[PDB]
Amino acid sequence: MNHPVESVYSALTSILLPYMGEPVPVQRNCSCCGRAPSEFDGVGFELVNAYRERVVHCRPCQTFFVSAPELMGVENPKKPTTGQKFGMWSGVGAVINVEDNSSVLLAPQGVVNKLPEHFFDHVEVITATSGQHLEYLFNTELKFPLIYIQNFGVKTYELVRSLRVSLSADAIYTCADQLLTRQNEVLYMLDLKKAKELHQEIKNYSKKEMDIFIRTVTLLAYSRITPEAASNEFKKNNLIPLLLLLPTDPHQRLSILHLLKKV
């Protein structure tokens, strides 16, 4: 009930209830989220995946494995009778406003084309690829708390177990269907407040100065240039006030630099 998968379900995949079906009561914890059945009210969906594994899904988890061609379009013409699945979407992002329960679907142009017009009524779909997700996050006024599924992907189990609610702009969790262990959440943490202030301060610097700053920071983060050389370049180009806004973590530096080079 009080879990991110329920939030995304109610906001985004509660549009496919009429093609979902009646759950079959179960006694084991859902294999997809992994949470105990105490919050599923004792019921569940019994299902077999393409690897012939007996899998239980809860009401939120099962929505990712539902075929609704009449609502989500046909994903592959070679298999008409199965449609686009939220758990099989790769390169498709989604921002879930938990408090408002509204959702925006950042899908590429091909996915938008495959979606029937009935889908756009329930879900507001903006045409954007995986590269323009950060553009949408940057420009749009996000409402918190929210769940930012950067890439729905195909690893639905790792997407559900990666779902983290982003309470504020300081730490926006980019869930991209890769298991969000505490060891790789730095790659999936988007510090949009710092990125926005760094972009605001990038305006004071010339295009050449900002290209030099970005290249120096990227090379240093990959240990291609010595810190002495990078410091010399920063001092010669007067980029120290930019550096004071950088996180000390090189992976965070790379993430925010990707954000800057996208905007």
What is the Cα–Cα distance from 227 to 214, expressed in whole angstroms? 14
| Residues that contact Zn ion, how many (by CB under 5 A) | 5
| Residues of the chain immediately before an interruption (C to N > 2.5 Å) | none
Contact between 30 and Zn ion per CB under 5 A: yes
**Residue 16 beta carbon to Zn ion: minimum distance, rounded to whole angstroms:** 16
CA distance 181 to 179: 6
The verdict on whether residue 61 carries a ligand-binding annotation is: yes
Position 163 contacts Zn ion (CB under 5 A):
no
Total residues contacting DNA by CB under 7 A comes to 18
Binding residue per annotation — 30?
Answer: yes
- Partner interacting with residue 58 (select from DNA, Zn ion, none; CB below 5-8 Å by kind): Zn ion
156 lines the binding site for DNA (CB under 7 A): yes
Sign of the dihedral defined by the CA atoms of residues 123, 41, 165, 249, in that order:
negative
Q: Which stretch binds DNA (CB under 7 A): 76-84, 141-149, 187-195, 234-242?
A: 76-84
Which are the contacts of 211, defined by CB distance < 8 A and separation ≥ 6?
none
Q: Minimum distance from CB of 39 to Zn ion (Å)?
A: 9
Place of tokens 């790659």: 187
* Nearest distance from C-beta of residue 81 to DNA, angstroms: 4
Counting contacts by CB under 7 A, is residue 150 touching DNA?
no
Q: How far apart are CA 93 and CA 116, in angstroms?
A: 18
Binding pattern for the stretch 55-74 against DNA, x by CB under 7 A and - elsewhere: ----------x-x-------
Which residues, numbered 36-55, are part of the site for DNA (CB under 7 A)? Answer: 49-51
CA 118 – CA 145 distance, rounded (Å): 28
Tell me how far apart the alpha carbons of residues 195 and 200 are, in angstroms, rounded to a whole number: 9
32 among annotated binding-site residues: no
155 touches DNA (CB under 7 A): yes
244 part of the interface to DNA, by CB under 7 A: no
Mark the binding-site residues for Zn(2+), compressed into ranges. Answer: 30, 33, 58, 61
Where along the sequence are the contacts to DNA (CB under 7 A)?
A: 49-51, 65, 67, 78-82, 85, 87-88, 90, 154-157
